Amino acid sequence: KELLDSDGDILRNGGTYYILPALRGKGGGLELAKTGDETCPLNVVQARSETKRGRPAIIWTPPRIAILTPAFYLNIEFQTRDLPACLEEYSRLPWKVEGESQEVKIAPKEEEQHLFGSFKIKPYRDDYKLVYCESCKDLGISIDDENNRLLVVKDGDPLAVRFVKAHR
C-alpha cells in the first residue's frame, strides 16, 4: 500500500497528476469552475463530461523527500497552463477549503504565510480518496443549483480517485 499513480509508480513529492474518477458514469477529472456569482473560476469541481481529464494538480509536502505516503500533509495546487484571463496573473493556484461553506476553492490571492497543506491521500477500496484535516474528513461531490459538481468536504461519501501522470 504505497500511493501509486495509475501506471503503478509511487506518487512523487511535487509531481503533477490529473485527478480522475475511479468510478465511471458521474463525471470526469477535477478542474476549475465559476460558481454562484464569482466572475473568476475559483471552485474546484469535477468536470461534468466523463471524457474530460480536467486540469493537472501539483501535489507536494514541505519535507524534502522524494515520494508521498498517506501519512504526509499535502499541498494541492492546480497547474497554471492555459488559464482564463482573470487567473493569468497568478503563478500558483493553491487549493484551500473555505470554512463554513466547506467548498474546496483555489486561493491565488492569499499570502504564502497563510497557506499550508492540509490534505492527505488515502487508499480507498481499490483506489484512493482525498481527505482534508481541519482529524480527517473525506472530500466528495456536492451538486449546486446549476449542476456544478463541487468538490467539498463530505465525510463518508468520498470521491474515489486515481492519479494519472500529467505529461508535458
Numbering used by the authors: 1 to 134, 141 to 174
Reported in the publication:
The plant protease inhibitor EcTI from Enterobobium contortisiliquum is a classical trypsin inhibitor belonging to the Kunitz family. A Kunitz-type inhibitor that was first isolated from Enterolobium contortisiliquum was named EcTI. It was shown that EcTI inhibits trypsin, chymotrypsin, plasma kallikrein, plasmin, human neutrophil elastase, and Factor XIIa in the stoichiometric ratio 1∶1, but not thrombin, bovine pancreatic elastase, or Factor Xa. The fold of EcTI is a β-trefoil, typical for the STI-related family of Kunitz inhibitors. As found in most known Kunitz-type inhibitors, EcTI has a single reactive site located on loop L5, between β-strands 4 and 5.
In this work, we investigated the structural basis of the activity of EcTI by determining its crystal structure in the unbound and trypsin-bound form. The structure of free EcTI was refined to a higher resolution of 1.75 Å. The final model contains two inhibitor molecules, two imidazole molecules, two glycerol molecules, and 244 water molecules. A loop region containing residues 23–26 of monomer B is in weak electron density, but is still included in the final model, whereas the density for the loop containing residues 111–113, not traced in the complex, is very clear. A molecule of EcTI contains two disulfide bonds, one intra-chain and one connecting two chains. However, since the crystal structures of EcTI were obtained under mildly reducing buffer conditions, the disulfide bond Cys40-Cys86 was broken in molecule A of the free EcTI, as well as in the inhibitor molecule in the EcTI-trypsin complex. This observation indicates that the disulfide bond Cys133-Cys142 plays a more important role in stabilizing the β-trefoil fold, whereas the disulfide bond Cys40-Cys86 may not be as necessary for its stability. The equivalent residue in EcTI is also Asn13, which similarly forms a network consisting of several hydrogen bonds. Taking monomer B of free EcTI as a reference, only the Cα atoms of the P1, P2, and P1′ residues exhibit minor shifts, whereas the remaining residues of the reactive loop are in almost exactly the same conformation.
